[PDB]
């Protein structure tokens, strides 16, 4: 295949260590739940990072089935493939994993900021000015909307669009992954004849 140049330099060991550090600080905050219940942000980040990491490892050759069966199995077809089992693409996957980690870090930062804001709110020591300073996007949107004659504080239509949004359950993730795998397989069929 054609050669691919990495956008950033980083080793797989360094990436794994960074992932472990990122997930280690939130262990106390992380809470387990039933498989059918909705997942949390920490759970979603851990699943995505570990899935990418172990897919890269299995492609490389580090066939550690104990962890691959946990962080990569989400479909009956995937389970069958695992049972049967038991360069440019790798570089792109590693770069994508690094980008994903850099994308998740700001989310955790915002979560920590919100935790501290909530702590000060419960104490009765939080002014609205401080909250707007430490939640800049809300502040800017509100100020701009009022400045352009958008006085109203209710947005029923946008809420209707976004109200039912929520993180999915593990079973829902399995179903969606199965659908995507089926779509990809059908795509490769068309590619073949």
Partner 1 sequence: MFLFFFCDLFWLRLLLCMYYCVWSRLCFIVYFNCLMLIFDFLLFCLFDLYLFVGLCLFLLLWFMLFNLYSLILYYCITYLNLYLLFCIVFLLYIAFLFLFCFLCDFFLFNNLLVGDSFMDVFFIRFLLCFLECFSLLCRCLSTFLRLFCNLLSS
Partner 2 sequence: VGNGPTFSTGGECMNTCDIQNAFPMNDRGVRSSSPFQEPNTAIYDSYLAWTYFQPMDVHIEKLPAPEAKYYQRHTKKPWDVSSTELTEIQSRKKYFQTLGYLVAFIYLYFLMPKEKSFSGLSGPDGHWIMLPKGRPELF
Partner 3 sequence: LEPMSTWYLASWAMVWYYAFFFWMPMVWTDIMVPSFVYNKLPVIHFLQEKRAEQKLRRVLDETY
CA distance 12 to 77: 27
- Name the residue among 92, 119, 108 with its Cα closest to residue 21: 108
Whole-number minimum distance, CB 29 to partner 2, in Å?
5
Question: For residues 53 and 72, what is the distance between their CA atoms, to the nearest angstrom?
Answer: 10
The one among 2, 86, 137, 157 contacting partner 1 by CB under 8 A: 157
142 contributes a contact to partner 2 by CB under 8 A? no
Please give the structure tokens belonging to residue 16.
Answer: 């794994």
* Under rule CB under 8 A, residue 163 binds partner 1: no
For residue 38, give the 3-state DSSP assignment: strand
**C-beta of 133: minimal distance to partner 2 in Å?**
5
Residue 8 contacts partner 2 per CB under 8 A: no
Task: Examine residue 60 and tell whether it contacts partner 2 (CB under 8 A).
Answer: no
Q: Are 53 and 97 in contact (CB under 8 A)?
A: yes
What is the distance between the alpha carbons of residues 176 and 183, in angstroms, rounded to a whole number?
Answer: 11
Q: Roughly what angle, to the nearest 10 degrees, separates helices 41-60 and 12-24?
A: 160
| Alpha-carbon gap, residue 78 to 65, rounded angstroms | 13
125 touches partner 1 by CB under 8 A: no
**Which listed option, partner 1, partner 3, partner 2, none, makes contact with residue 118 (CB within 5 to 8 Å by class)?**
partner 2
Q: Are 88 and 82 in contact (CB under 8 A)?
A: no
Task: Name 185's Cβ contacts closer than 8 Å, sequence gap at least 6.
Answer: none
> Which stretch in 4-12, 97-105, 136-144, 150-158 sits in contact with partner 1 by CB under 8 A?
150-158
Q: Point out which residues bind partner 3 (CB under 8 A).
A: 41, 44, 47-48, 51-52, 74, 100, 103, 107, 110, 128, 131-132, 135, 137-139, 141-143, 145-147, 151, 153-155, 158-159, 162-163, 165-168, 173, 176-177, 180-181, 184
Q: Point out which residues bind partner 1 (CB under 8 A).
A: 127-129, 149-152, 156-157
Q: Point out which residues bind partner 2 (CB under 8 A).
A: 25-26, 28-29, 105-106, 108-113, 115-119, 121-133, 136, 139, 153-154, 159, 163
């Amino acid at each position: 295949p054609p050669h691919y140049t990495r956008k950033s330099s980083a080793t797989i060991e360094q990436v794994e260590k960074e992932i472990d550090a990122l997930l280690g600080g939130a262990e106390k905050l992380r809470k387990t739940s039933t498989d059918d219940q909705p997942m949390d942000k920490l759970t979603l980040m851990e699943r995505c990072l570990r899935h990418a990491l172990w897919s890269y490892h299995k492609e490389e050759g580090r066939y550690d089935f104990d962890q691959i069966g946990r962080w990569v199995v989400y479909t009956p077809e995937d389970e069958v493939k695992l049972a049967q089992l038991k360069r440019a693409s790798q570089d792109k996957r590693l770069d994508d994993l690094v980008d994903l980690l850099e994308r998740f870090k700001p989310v955790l930062a915002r979560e920590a900021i919100m935790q501290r804001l909530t702590i000060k709110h419960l104490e009765g020591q939080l002014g609205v000015w401080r909250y707007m300073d430490w939640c800049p996007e809300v502040r800017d949107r509100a100020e701009l909307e009022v400045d352009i004659t958008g006085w109203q504080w209710w947005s029923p239509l946008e809420e209707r669009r976004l109200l039912p949004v929520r993180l999915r359950s593990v079973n829902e993730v399995r179903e969606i992954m199965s659908k995507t795998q089926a779509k990809k397989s059908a795509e490769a069929a068309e590619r073949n004849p």
